[PDB]
Amino acid sequence: TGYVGLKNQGATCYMNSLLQTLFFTNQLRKAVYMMPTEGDDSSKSVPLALQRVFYELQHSDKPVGTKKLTKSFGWETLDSFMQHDVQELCRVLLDNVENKMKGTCVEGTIPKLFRGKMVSYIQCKEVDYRSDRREDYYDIQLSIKGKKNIFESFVDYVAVEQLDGDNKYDAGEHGLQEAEKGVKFLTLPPVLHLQLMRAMYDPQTDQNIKINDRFEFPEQLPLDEFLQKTDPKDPANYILHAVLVHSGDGHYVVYLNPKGDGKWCKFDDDVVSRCTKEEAIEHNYGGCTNAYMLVYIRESKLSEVLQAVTDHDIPQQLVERLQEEKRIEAQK
Ligand SMILES: COc1cnccc1-c1ccc(C(=O)N2CC[C@@H](C(=O)N3CCC(O)(Cn4cnc5c(ccn5C)c4=O)CC3)[C@H](c3ccccc3)C2)s1
Numbered sequence: 061t062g063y064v065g066l067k068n069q070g071a072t073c074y075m076n077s078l079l080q081t082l083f084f085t086n087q088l089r090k091a092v093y094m095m096p097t098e099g100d101d102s103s104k105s106v107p108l109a110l111q112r113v114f115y116e117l118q119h120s121d122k123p124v125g126t127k128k129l130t131k132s133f134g135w136e137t138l139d140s141f142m143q144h145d146v147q148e149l150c151r152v153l154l155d156n157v158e159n160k161m162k163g164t165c166v167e168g169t170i171p172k173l174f175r176g177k178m179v180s181y182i183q184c185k186e187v188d189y190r191s192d193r194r195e196d197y198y199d200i201q202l203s204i205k206g207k208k209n210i211f212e213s214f215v216d217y218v219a220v221e222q223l224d225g226d227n228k229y230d231a232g233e234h235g236l237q238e239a240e241k242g243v244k245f246l247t248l249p250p251v252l253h254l255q256l257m258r259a260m261y262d263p264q265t266d267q268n269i270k271i272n273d274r275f276e277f278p279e280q281l282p283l284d285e286f287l288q289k290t291d292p293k294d295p296a297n298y299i300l301h302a303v304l305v306h307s308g309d310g311h312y313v314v315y316l317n318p319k320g321d322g323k324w325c326k327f328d329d330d331v332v333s334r335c336t337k338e339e340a341i342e343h344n345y346g347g348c349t350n351a352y353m354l355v356y357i358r359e360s361k362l363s364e365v366l367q368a369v370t371d372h373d374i375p376q377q378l379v380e381r382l383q384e385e386k387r388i389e390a391q392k
Pocket residue numbers: 071073074141142144145146147201255256257258259260268269270271306308309310311352
């Protein structure tokens with residue numbers, strides 16, 4: 061493979077899977093390295109700690125650890141991971157980084173990479189009144205129960221809902237109204253984080269029940285037909301980068317093809333093996349082991365996103381600090 065694993069330090073669950081997905085977002089990695097953590101607290105700093113994991117992933121020949129990172133964002137006490145969805149762990153990390161990059165030359169990399177735009181509208185069926193609000197989004201949550209595949213989930217996602225008796229829209233001056241609500245996509249970003257809604261509410265066992273149902277997703281994904289305006293110059297065609305997997309009800313795993321080239325690996329904690337396309341994609345449709353999150357890259361943008369990273373893409377200042385820091389760790 062040429063690729064190093066992560067040590068599975070706590071019940072950090074999905075974290076290793078997420079870290080790897082993020083690491084192989086090369087345009088993100090190289091921005092991360094440029095963050096000015098010169099005088100950042102060694103242990104309190106989330107942005108430092110991420111630089112450390114990345115550094116190590118790029119250099120270590122031996123499984124990489126996460127303790128200082130876990131501690132940094134204070135997710136240690138058991139339940140810290142269970143209580144949160146994978147996209148929340150993402151948000152925490154990216155938000156920290158987004159903010160650290162403020163006032164620098166790499167200011168703006170996060171939104172640049174992950175933020176798409178969207179419109180929620182309410183349209184009264186009988187009256188002229190229409191509310192329009194554009195929203196930003198860094199990730200998309202798809203319904204799967206009773207959907208075959210991505211297309212059916214996306215369909216549902218932009219589906220029109222009717223606001224009738226009881227759910228009647230309060231149209232302000234025009235009282236209650238039969239009205240229809242929907243969402244529609246203005247843009248998609250270079251990198252597309254999709255989460256599949258496999259946990260749902262239990263009015264019985266009162267826990268999060270996992271839906272192991274088959275759900276189908278393609279290696280290539282066209283989305284122009286979900287846009288308002290399409291663009292000939294750059295269509296919304298997406299390339300499958302990463303499949304975050306979970307089996308049971310739990311072991312966590314992630315398949316990547318880091319260069320987007322269909323050369324897949326399986327990343328299970330310390331153990332990284334090359335794997336077949338089948339093992340990565342169809343084998344994880346489900347029906348138990350199955351995907352819960354996908355990562356697509358916009359074909360047009362692959363080469364900037366997955367731009368090559370050299371060892372000289374780490375500031376030598378940063379290297380110095382980490383090397384010293386590693387050295388001083390000398391147990392009798
Ligand atoms: C015995 O306890 C242990 C001891 N030692 C180590 C580990 C444990 C464990 C304890 C519990 C484990 C477990 O099995 N859990 C808990 C976490 C949970 C998890 O990893 N999640 C991330 C993916 C997730 O966010 C995806 N997602 C995001 N947003 C959503 C939905 C649905 C609606 N919305 C708005 C959604 O499904 C769901 C939660 C697991 C899971 C996996 C797949 C599908 C559903 C749910 C279920 S493992």
